[PDB]
């Protein structure tokens, strides 16, 4: 476990303005999702059949260590609830029900129900994650180290290890892909550290 991870986590979490600046982007989304009027940190997915839908955060990270919390009620996950990161090129919509985040070279994601990591998922098989194994609770932390070029996760205070490597040099945004009608996913930026 990196020492920098605890340094970031043990600072008081970012305030509302920062949370809002790093929240889901209403300009960068599948047309089937919308940022809630009463809660700018959460999106709502319209109940569209045979549709996979994504949204990126407003901020693309290039350097430093960053973490954010995803709150995704377990009952609102369906067959493919994928959490991760993506370049600006990652498609935010697919037909059918797919692990859209992690489907090609432009995104990396953890499919919550399958407990599988996808990257270039159309050509590469999913990877079991965590490596030691797992029923996922409603919230999890996503840790993006743009200096080491890693993606990691924290579930129930437990650091689950490195999920992905080779992210340095990219501009990566928080992203999720959802298939469940009426699902609501909240993202709250925790904090960032400089390189």
């Amino acid at each position: 476990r990196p020492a920098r991870l605890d340094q970031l986590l043990d600072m008081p979490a970012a305030g509302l303005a920062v949370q809002l600046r790093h929240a889901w982007n209403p300009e960068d989304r599948s047309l089937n999702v919308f940022v809630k009027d009463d809660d700018r940190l959460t999106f709502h997915r319209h109940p569209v059949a045979q549709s996979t839908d994504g949204i990126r955060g407003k901020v693309g990270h290039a350097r430093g260590l960053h973490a954010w919390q995803i709150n995704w009620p377990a009952r609102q996950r369906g067959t493919h609830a994928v959490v991760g990161v993506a370049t600006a090129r990652a498609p935010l919509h697919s037909v059918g029900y797919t692990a859209l985040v992690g489907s090609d070279a432009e995104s990396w994601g953890w499919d919550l129900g399958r407990s599988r990591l996808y990257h270039d998922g159309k050509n590469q098989p999913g990877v079991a994650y965590p490596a030691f194994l797992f029923a996922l609770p409603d919230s999890l932390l996503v840790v993006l180290d743009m200096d080491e070029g890693t993606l990691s996760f924290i579930v129930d205070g437990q650091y689950l290890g490195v999920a992905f490597r080779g992210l340095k040099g990219k501009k990566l945004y928080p992203v999720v892909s959802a298939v469940w009608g009426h699902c609501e996913v909240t993202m709250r930026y925790i904090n960032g550290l400089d390189p």
Partner: peptide
């Protein structure tokens, strides 16, 4: 509703 992803 046949759909298993709450899309009905």
């Amino acid at each position: 509703x046949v759909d298993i992803n709450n899309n009905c």
